[PDB]
Ligand binder design. Structure first.
Ligand SMILES: OC[C@H]1O[C@@H](O[C@H]2[C@H](O)[C@@H](O)[C@H](S[C@H]3[C@H](O)[C@@H](O)[C@H](O[C@H]4[C@H](O)[C@@H](O)[C@H](S[C@H]5[C@H](O)[C@@H](O)[C@H](O[C@H]6[C@H](O)[C@@H](O)[C@H](S[C@H]7[C@H](O)[C@@H](O)[C@H](O[C@H]8[C@H](O)[C@@H](O)[C@H](S[C@H]9[C@H](O)[C@@H](O)[C@H](O)O[C@@H]9CO)O[C@@H]8CO)O[C@@H]7CO)O[C@@H]6CO)O[C@@H]5CO)O[C@@H]4CO)O[C@@H]3CO)O[C@@H]2CO)[C@H](O)[C@@H](O)[C@@H]1S
Ligand SMILES: [Ca+2]
Length: 629
């Protein structure tokens, strides 16, 4: 039987769940897939509001798990897994096993350099550069009896707004797409959206392929997908709680547990350097697990031929603290119901749990905020790490891993998303390493929450960094990183971040007994409920400071390359963001946005992001369970 919950906060969960699931609110497509946001005029990581992301799907899982806990009905949670498998994990038709079975674990992919400006792409493939061996592929094909990968592709054009359709048909929905391809300076404003399945039917002469990669011959027809490890790890996290909550009530989500466990087994590909080079010795090809950093890196990716049979897989050399999930790693390595089938699945996750906790502590600043991360591939070309750069297992510190436009660690949101998982681990296990991190981090952030007399509040929004951590010595441990400092640049009322913050502080308070954390969590939740509720969930008006880029951002197109988007928009040198997305001019908010820009005003919007609404709902449910009085 489930323990009693605080009825006030349970009712607030239940209300939010109804608003989110309400067909009249429009959070979901007709196929039952959640959109990034209700509103369509939306550019921030996805560049259209009615895409879906693996991030949104994993929040949909967490939301439904919590509904199961309060309602006793887990059919919604099982359905969230069904929708995921149907639409976001590429099927047999989307990643033909005929190509995947031709994968060569001794030569997983061909090296190409990354560049610091999009104008340097296409990047030339070089077969002479060393590439290491993949030691896990044989474990996976042996356990699961296929060469297909079981992981979510990160983004889906749910209603076929771009027009690529499914497997180049132009008409089916949903449509697998990707955007980012051209390194750290390619913002969301500078991409050329492209189909995952490229049969050269759209775009240029060879579809979109030769915008990004240059090979010897004629570009082949080919598919490719990219994982977002932080989403797949959150799926495992959510499913663990669904299982716990289901078993407290004599119910079962065993089917979904098997899917989560399998996903966690494939998620190990994010543990490896991009081209399986040795960690801390990047000039050398790895021999297997010497190429594993055991962190959740920015991606893994795979692809292969459509009309001939070959395939490739890469991990990623770049690691951000924001992606780590020690809770998921604890689950997969210790809980017998979530032990992966592969021979080394559980022990690899055990190593990852230890490595991840070291990583957070290495990056913890003097004040307590967590700095960016590290890379095994300096400048994305395995260049020499400058003398004086601090290192973690031979990987050089990077202040803003992977993206510089804007810096990937200049947003406060990464702090809460990631420390929330450390707080669950600490709540569940009392782990000393987690305690130490949280004591200092929570003390930092409790000093940065500002409550106003009118019931409104502010928390950090944009942050900046000085210095670097001390070189990590696993036997010395944490030095205090006296020369690493966070700066709060501005404050805001980001409701998704405030919700995640409330969640983190609630788990931490429950375990540590810290009253200041508990009351800050409740005050945030109350302020949001009382002051920001609307008929669709919660919202506030926000400034969209980068929206001038709709009209003024030039998109790079190589000299002489011309093509067309499916709607006929011409792609050629000179185009702006809006020129290759001309359907955006039909958006109900377009004229409002343009009028603002014409007057030299910053446009504002009131946005209902699926992840933020779910975050708020889950944060209420968490407080209700942990603080029943
Ligand atoms: O012999 C036969 C045959 O051979 C052929 O040759 C072959 C050869 O054999 C073969 O080896 C090679 S393989 C080659 C391949 O060809 C080539 O294509 C491939 O290239 C790869 C590149 O090397 C690699 O660099 C790139 S990596 C890139 C990925 O592609 C891309 O998908 C990924 O995108 C990421 C994305 O960056 C990330 O964001 C997301 S997930 C999630 C985040 O986790 C989360 O933070 C974020 O949250 C958002 C939130 O949603 C928002 O609401 C908030 S908004 C917030 C504001 O930010 C605040 O400022 C504001 O104040 O408040 C607001 C409100 O809160 O913001 C947060 C934070 O941002 O959201 C997102 C989700 O929404 O994940 C994705 C996925 O990970 O990026 C990666 C890094 O850039 O990949 C390329 C592949 O795609 O390389 C291989 C090997 O080299 O191929 C040969 C040629 O074919 C011959 O050719 C033949 O002839 C013959 S027949
Ligand atoms: Ca740029």
């Amino acid at each position: 039987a489930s323990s009693p919950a605080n009825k006030v906060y349970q009712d607030r969960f239940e209300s939010m769940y109804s608003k989110i699931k309400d067909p009249a609110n429009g959070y979901f497509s007709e196929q039952g897939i959640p959109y990034h946001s209700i509103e369509t005029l939306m550019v921030e990581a996805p560049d259209y509001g009615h895409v879906t992301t693996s991030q949104a799907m994993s929040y949909y899982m967490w939301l439904e798990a919590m509904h199961g806990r309060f309602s006793g009905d887990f059919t919604g949670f099982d359905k969230s897994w069904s929708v995921t498998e149907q639409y976001l994990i590429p099927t047999e038709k989307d990643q033909p096993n005929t190509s995947m079975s031709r994968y060569d674990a001794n030569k997983p992919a061909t090296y190409a350099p990354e560049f610091q400006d999009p104008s340097k792409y296409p990047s030339p493939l070089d077969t002479s550069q060393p590439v290491g061996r993949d030691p896990i592929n044989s474990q996976l094909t042996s356990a699961y009896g296929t060469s297909m990968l079981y992981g979510m592709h990160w983004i889906l054009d749910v209603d076929n707004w771009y027009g690529f359709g499914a497997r180049a048909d132009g008409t089916s929905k949903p449509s697998y797409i990707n955007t980012f391809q051209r390194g750290e300076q390619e913002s969301t404003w500078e991409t050329i959206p492209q189909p995952c399945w490229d049969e050269h039917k759209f775009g240029g002469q060879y579809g979109f392929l030769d915008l990004f990669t240059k090979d010897t011959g004629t570009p082949a027809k080919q598919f490719k997908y990219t994982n977002a490890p932080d989403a797949d790890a959150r799926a495992v996290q959510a499913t663990y709680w669904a299982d716990q909550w289901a078993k407290e009530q004599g119910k079962s989500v065993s089917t979904s547990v098997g899917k989560a466990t399998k996903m966690g087994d494939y998620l190990r590909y994010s543990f490896f350097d991009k081209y399986f080079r040795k960690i801390g010795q990047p000039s050398q090809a790895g021999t297997g697990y010497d190429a594993a950093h055991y962190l959740l890196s920015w991606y893994y990716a795979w692809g292969g031929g459509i009309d001939s049979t070959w395939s490739w897989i890469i991990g990623s050399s770049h690691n951000h603290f924001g992606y780590q999930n020690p809770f998921a790693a604890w689950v997969l390595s210790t809980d017998a119901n979530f032990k992966p089938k592969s021979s080394n699945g559980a022990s690899d996750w055990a190593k990852s749990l230890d490595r991840q906790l070291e990583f957070y502590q290495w990056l913890q600043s003097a004040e307590g905020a967590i700095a960016g991360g590290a890379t095994n591939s300096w400048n994305g070309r395995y260049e020499a790490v400058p003398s004086g750069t601090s290192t973690f297992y031979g990987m050089g510190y990077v202040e803003n891993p992977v993206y510089a436009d804007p810096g990937s660690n200049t947003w406060f949101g990464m702090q809460v998303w990631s420390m929330q998982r450390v707080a669950e681990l600490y709540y569940k296990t009392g782990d000393a390493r987690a305690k130490k991190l949280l004591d200092k981090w929570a003390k930092w952030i409790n000093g940065e929450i500002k409550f106003n007399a009118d019931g409104t509040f502010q928390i950090p929004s944009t942050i900046d960094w000085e210095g670097q951590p001390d070189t990590w010595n696993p036997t010395q441990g944490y030095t205090g990183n006296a020369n690493l400092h966070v700066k709060v640049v501005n404050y805001g009322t980001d409701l998704g971040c405030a919700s995640s913050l409330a969640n983190t502080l609630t788990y931490y308070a429950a375990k540590s007994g810290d009253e200041t954390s508990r009351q800050n969590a409740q005050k945030l939740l109350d302020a949001m409920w009382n002051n920001y509720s609307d008929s669709k969930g919660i919202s506030t008006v926000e400034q969209r400071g980068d929206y001038h880029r709709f009209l003024d951002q030039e998109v790079f197109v190589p000299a002489g390359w011309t093509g067309k988007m499916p709607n006929g928009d011409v792609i050629k040198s000179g185009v702006k963001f809006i020129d290759i997305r001309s359907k955006y001019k039909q958006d109900p908010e377009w004229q409002t946005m343009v009028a603002a820009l014409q007057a030299g005003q910053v446009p504002t919007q009131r946005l209902h992001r699926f992840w933020a609404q779910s975050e708020f709902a889950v944060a209420n449910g968490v407080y209700a369970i942990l603080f029943p009085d």
